[PDB]
Write a protein that binds this ligand. Structure first.
Ligand code: ATP
Ligand code: ATP
Lengths: 111, 299, 218, 299, 218
C-alpha cells in the first residue's frame, strides 16, 4: 500500500516534471526569446529606438504622426504595453505554476 | 490736334536734354520696383503654387481582431465608403507589417513575439458627407459606429504648427509689400516734383505771356508718365535676369529635398497692369507738382 | 483805352510804390513814362498788364474793369498786349525761333504762317541771322531784341515797353523807336518807360513823369 | 574754424528754405531704408532660433555584446574620443539603464525580464571637418563600420535640410539685401544731385572772386550728410515702431506652436553703423554732384 | 597793367567775336570802351577777367601772362579784379548785405570790419536803407547798384565795368561815374564799357572803339 502510494507520488512527480518542462518551454522561452522581444519593444525607446523623439516632422509626413499615434511607433508602444501586461501576467502565472509544481513535488517528496 | 504732338515733342526734348539726369532717375525707379515684382514670384511660385494638402485628420478607427479582407469592404460599406470618406487606406494585417518594419520602428520582434498585433484600422479621407467640421465631430463617432474597429485613432493634425505660418507669416510679408508699394510711389513722385522744380522758370515765363492753365500742364504730364512707364519697363527687363538666375539654385535643392518646385516668370496679364499703374503714378505726381507750382506765380 | 482812377499800390512790407495815380490814354496814343530810379514805373506797367493787384482805386483796360479779375480770365487780358520786360524773360533752353513763335502757338496758328510771321518779326529787328541759336549764344542787346521781336509778333492792341532800348546803342535805339512809331501809326496804343533824355527830346509825345509814386505828369 | 560754422549755417539755411521738398526727400530715404533693417532683423532672429534648436544630432553606432569598459576605452581611442568627436557620451551599461527607465519608454521590466541588455551608446559630436554630410557619407559608414559597435543609427538628414534652408535664406536674402542697399544708394545720390542741380545757379561764387573749389564745396557736403543722416534717423524710429506692431501677434503664435520666441531689435552698434554709413554715402554723393558742376562752369 | 598783344577769340560755332585786338593800359589809367551792339566788348572784358580763353595772341595782367593760366590759379587773378557784369550775377536767395559781403568772406576778414565796410559800400551807392531786403524786393536800378557795391567793396586793383549805368537815370549815372573817378584817383585802373554818349562826351578820357571785333581806337 505504501508502494502504491509511492507509485502514485512518482507518477505525480513525473507529471510535475512534465509540467516543469512545459513551464520551461512557455515561461523560460518567454524569458529568453520573447524577452529579447520585450526588451526590444522597450529598446524602441532604450536600444536603437526612439530616444524620446520630439523632433518636428517635415512636410508630407509618411506616417510619422500616425506612427506615434498607432503604427510602428505609437501602436508599437501600445502593443508593447499590452505585451508587457501579458508578460507580467505570464510572470505571475510562472510564479504560480512554480508554486504549484513545488507543492506537487513537495507532496511527492514528503510522501 | 497739333497741341498733343507739340507737347509730346517738348516733353521728349526736355527728357533728352539731360541724359545722365534722366538715366539716373529711371535707374532708381526700376530698382525700387523690382522688389515687389520679385517678391511676388515667391508668393505666386512655391507658396500657393506648390500647395501640397495639409495636416488633415485622415487618421481613423482602430479595428479589432475581427477585421479581415472581407471586413475591409464591410467597414467600407458602413463608414469607409458609405459615411464621409473619399479614399481607402486599409493597411490591415500584412499590409502594415513590412511597411512598419522599414519605418522608424525596427523589426525583428515579430519573429520573436509570436505575431505582431498591429491594432487594425484604415486611414480615410472624410468626403463632403463627413468632411464638414461638425459633419465629422459628432458624426465622427457615428463614423466609428460602422462595422467592428475596436478603437478609433482618428486625430486632428496641423495643431499650432498651422499657426506659426498663418499668423507670423501672414502679416510680416504683407507689411513688407505695403512698404515697397509705398516706396515706389514716393520715389516716382519725388523725382517728378524735382524735375518740375528745376524748370519752374519756364512755367513762370510762359504764364505771364498769356497762355492758359492747361497749355502749361501738358509737357509736364507727358514727361511724368513717360518717366514712370520707362522706369517700369526696365524693371520688367530686370526681374527676369534675377528670376532665371535664381532658377538654378531652386532646381538644385529640388532633388536634394524631394518634390521639384518649378519656378516661372511674370505674366503679360500682370506686366501690362504694372506698366499702367506706374504710368498713372507718374502722371498724377506731375499734375500735383505743376498745379502746386502754378498757383505760386499768380500775384 | 487805359484809365487809372486813384490807383495806389503798396507791396508787402511797407514800401508804398504808387500813391494816387490817375490818368487816361485814348485808343491809338503814344506816351513816355519817365521818372527817377525806384519811382514806380515797372509797378505801373505791371498793374496795367495784370501781374500785380492794386491796393486801392480802379484800373480800366479796353473799357472793362480789371481791378478785380478772375484767374480764369487773366490769360485773355494778357493776350491783347505785347509786353517788353526788363529781365528779357526768355526761355533759355529753346531756340530764338521758338521763343518768338511761342505766342502764335499759344494763340493757335498754323505752321507755315508761324514760319512766315516769325521770320518777318525777326527781320524787323535784325536777328534773322541768329534764328537757330540758343539765347545763351547772344549778346545782351541781341537778347533784348529777341524780346522785342517776341512782343510785336502777334499784332497786339497795346504795347507796354519797360526800358526797351537799354543795352542798345543810339542808332539801334532810334531804329526800335521808329518800329514802335510805325506800329502806332496803325492804331496801337504805346506806353514806353524810358531812362533816355536824348531819345525823348527829339520827339513830341505826351510825357507822364512820376516822382516817388506820385504822377503829377498827366 | 569760422568757415565750418558759416558753411554749416548755409547748409541749414538751404535745407530749411523749402520744407516740403526736404521732408519728402527724407521720407523717401527712410522708407527705402526701413526694408533692409526689417529683413536683417528677421534673418538674425531666425538664425538665432535655428542655432538654439539643434546644432548636431547624437546618433551613433549601436554597440553589440562585445562592448565593455575596455571595449569602450578602445572605442574612445578609435572613434569616440580620437576621431571626429567634440565631447564624450559613452552611456554604457547602467548609465543607459535609469535613463532608459525615465525616458518615454516605461521601465520596471528589469525586475521580471532578468537583466536589461542596455546598449553601449557612444555618442560623440564630430568636428567641423566631419560635420558635413558629404564628408560624413562614406566616412560615416566607415566610422560606424570601424570596430566595436555593430549596428549604426544613421541620421535622417535633418541637418542637411536645415543647411539647404539656410542656403536659401542665404542666397535669396543676400540678393534682396544687395538690391535694397543699391536702392538706398541711388535714392540718396539722386536726391542730392537734383538738389544741387536746382541750386546750381551759384556760378556767381565761382566767377566772382577766388572762391576756390574748397570754399564752394563745403556748403554742399555738409548739406548732403545732413540729408542722409536725417534719413537714417527717421528710419530707426520708423523701423522700431513697425516691429513693435508685428511683435505681440508674432510672439503669441510662437508660444502656441512651441516657445514664445519673440523678436529683438538693433544693438546700439548697429544703429551707429547705419547712421555713419548713411552720412558717408550722402557726403560722397554731394562731392560727386558738386564736382560735376565745378567743371562745366570753367573756361 | 593790362596788355593785349594780337588777341583773337572765335566762339565755338563759327562766330568771330574779336580779331586782332592789341593795346596797352598803364596802372591807374581810366578809359572807356565803346561800340555798336555785338561788337565784342563783353568778350574783351571776359578775356581780361579769365572767364574766356583767347584763341590766339597774348594777354598780360600785372606782368604775368594769363593766356595759358591754369585752373588752380584763376581764383587769385579773379580776386585782384572788381567786375560788374551786365546780368548783375547776384545770388537771389540772400540779403543784399550777404551779396555785398561775400567777397570779404572769401578774402578772410573779421566780423566788425565786414559790417563796417559793407555799410560804407552800401551807402556809397545809396542802398543802406535796404541792407536787409532780398534782391527780389528791389528794382532794376537798385539791383544794378547792389552789383556796383559788391564790386567796389574789396578795394581792387583793376575795375572792369560792363555798362554799369544802363537802368540808372542821369543823376545816378553821374553819381556812379564820380564814384569810379574817386576810386581811380587813388591808382585803380578803370575800364568802363558803355554806349551812352552824354556821359563820355562831358569827360575827356581815352576811348577804345570796337566795330565787329576790331579795335578802331587805341
Ligand atoms: N517785388 C517787390 N516787392 C517789394 N517792393 C518792390 C518790389 N519790386 C519793386 N519794389 C519797390 O517798389 C518801388 C518801385 O519799384 P519799381 O520796380 O516800380 O521801380 P522802377 O521804376 O522800375 O525802377 P528802375 O527805374 O530802377 O527800374 C521801389 O521802392 C522798389 O524797391
Ligand atoms: N557764348 C557765346 N557763344 C557764341 N557766340 C557768342 C557768345 N556770346 C557772345 N557771342 C557772340 O560774340 C559777338 C560779341 O558778343 P559780345 O557779348 O561780346 O558783344 P557786346 O559788344 O558785349 O554786345 P552788347 O553791346 O549788345 O552788350 C556777337 O556775335 C555775339 O552774338
Amino acid at each position: 500500500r505504501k508502494l502504491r502510494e509511492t507509485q502514485n507520488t512518482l507518477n505525480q512527480l513525473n507529471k510535475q516534471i512534465d509540467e516543469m518542462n512545459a513551464s520551461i518551454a512557455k515561461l523560460e522561452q518567454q524569458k529568453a526569446a520573447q524577452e529579447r522581444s520585450l526588451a526590444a519593444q522597450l529598446d524602441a525607446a532604450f536600444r536603437q529606438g526612439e530616444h524620446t523623439g520630439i523632433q518636428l516632422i517635415l512636410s508630407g509626413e509618411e506616417s510619422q504622426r500616425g506612427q506615434r499615434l498607432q503604427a510602428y511607433f505609437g501602436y508599437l508602444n501600445q502593443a508593447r504595453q499590452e505585451t508587457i501586461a501579458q508578460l507580467k501576467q505570464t510572470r505571475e502565472e510562472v510564479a504560480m505554476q512554480r508554486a504549484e509544481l513545488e507543492e506537487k513535488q513537495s507532496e511527492q517528496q514528503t510522501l | 490736334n497739333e497741341q498733343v504732338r507739340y507737347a509730346f515733342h517738348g516733353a521728349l526734348q526736355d527728357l533728352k536734354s539731360k541724359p545722365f539726369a534722366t538715366f539716373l532717375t529711371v535707374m532708381v525707379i526700376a530698382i525700387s520696383l523690382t522688389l515687389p515684382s520679385v517678391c511676388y514670384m515667391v508668393y505666386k511660385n512655391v507658396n500657393q503654387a506648390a500647395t501640397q494638402y495639409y495636416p488633415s485628420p485622415q487618421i481613423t478607427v482602430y479595428l479589432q481582431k475581427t477585421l479581415d479582407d472581407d471586413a475591409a469592404a464591410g467597414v467600407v460599406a458602413q463608414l469607409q465608403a458609405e459615411q464621409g470618406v473619399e479614399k481607402v487606406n486599409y493597411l490591415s494585417r500584412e499590409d502594415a507589417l513590412g511597411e512598419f518594419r522599414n519605418w522608424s520602428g525596427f523589426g525583428g520582434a515579430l519573429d520573436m513575439l509570436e505575431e505582431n498585433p498591429l491594432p487594425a484600422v484604415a486611414v480615410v479621407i472624410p468626403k463632403l458627407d463627413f468632411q464638414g467640421t461638425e459633419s465629422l465631430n459628432t458624426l465622427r463617432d457615428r463614423i466609428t459606429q460602422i462595422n467592428g474597429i475596436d478603437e478609433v485613432r482618428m486625430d486632428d493634425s496641423w495643431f499650432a504648427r498651422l499657426a506659426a505660418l498663418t499668423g507670423l507669416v501672414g502679416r510680416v510679408s504683407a507689411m513688407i509689400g505695403v512698404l515697397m508699394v509705398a516706396a515706389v510711389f514716393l520715389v516716382i513722385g519725388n523725382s517728378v516734383r524735382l524735375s518740375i522744380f528745376a524748370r519752374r522758370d519756364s512755367i513762370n515765363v510762359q504764364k505771364l505771356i498769356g497762355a492758359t492753365d492747361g497749355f502749361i500742364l501738358r509737357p509736364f504730364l507727358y514727361g511724368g508718365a513717360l518717366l514712370g512707364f520707362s522706369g517700369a519697363l526696365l524693371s520688367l527687363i530686370l526681374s527676369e535676369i534675377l528670376v532665371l538666375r535664381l532658377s538654378s539654385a531652386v532646381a538644385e535643392v529640388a532633388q536634394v529635398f524631394g518634390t521639384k518646385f518649378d519656378i516661372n516668370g511674370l505674366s503679360f496679364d500682370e506686366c501690362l497692369l504694372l506698366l499702367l499703374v506706374c504710368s498713372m503714378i507718374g502722371w498724377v505726381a506731375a499734375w500735383l507738382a505743376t498745379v502746386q507750382h502754378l498757383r505760386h506765380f499768380t500775384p | 483805352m487805359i484809365r487809372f482812377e486813384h490807383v495806389s499800390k503798396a507791396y508787402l512790407g511797407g514800401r508804398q510804390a504808387l500813391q494816387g495815380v490817375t490818368f487816361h490814354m485814348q485808343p491809338g496814343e503814344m506816351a513816355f513814362l519817365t521818372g527817377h530810379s525806384g519811382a514806380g514805373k515797372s509797378t505801373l506797367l505791371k498793374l496795367i498788364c495784370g501781374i500785380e493787384r492794386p491796393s486801392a482805386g480802379k484800373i480800366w483796360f479796353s473799357g472793362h474793369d480789371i481791378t478785380r479779375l478772375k484767374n480764369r480770365e487773366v490769360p485773355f487780358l494778357r493776350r491783347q498786349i505785347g509786353m517788353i520786360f526788363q529781365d528779357h524773360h526768355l526761355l533759355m533752353d529753346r531756340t530764338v525761333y521758338d521763343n518768338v513763335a511761342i505766342p502764335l502757338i499759344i494763340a493757335g496758328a498754323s505752321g507755315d504762317d508761324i514760319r512766315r510771321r516769325v521770320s518777318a518779326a525777326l527781320d524787323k529787328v535784325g536777328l534773322l541771322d541768329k534764328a537757330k541759336n540758343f539765347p545763351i549764344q547772344l549778346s545782351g542787346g541781341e537778347q533784348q531784341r529777341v524780346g522785342i521781336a517776341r512782343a510785336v509778333v502777334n499784332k497786339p492792341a497795346v504795347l507796354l515797353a519797360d526800358q526797351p532800348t537799354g543795352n542798345l546803342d543810339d542808332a539801334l535805339s532810334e531804329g526800335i523807336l521808329r518800329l514802335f512809331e510805325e506800329f502806332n501809326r496803325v492804331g496801337v496804343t504805346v506806353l514806353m518807360a524810358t531812362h533816355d533824355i536824348n531819345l525823348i527830346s527829339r520827339r513830341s509825345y505826351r510825357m507822364l513823369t512820376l516822382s516817388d509814386g506820385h504822377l503829377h505828369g498827366g
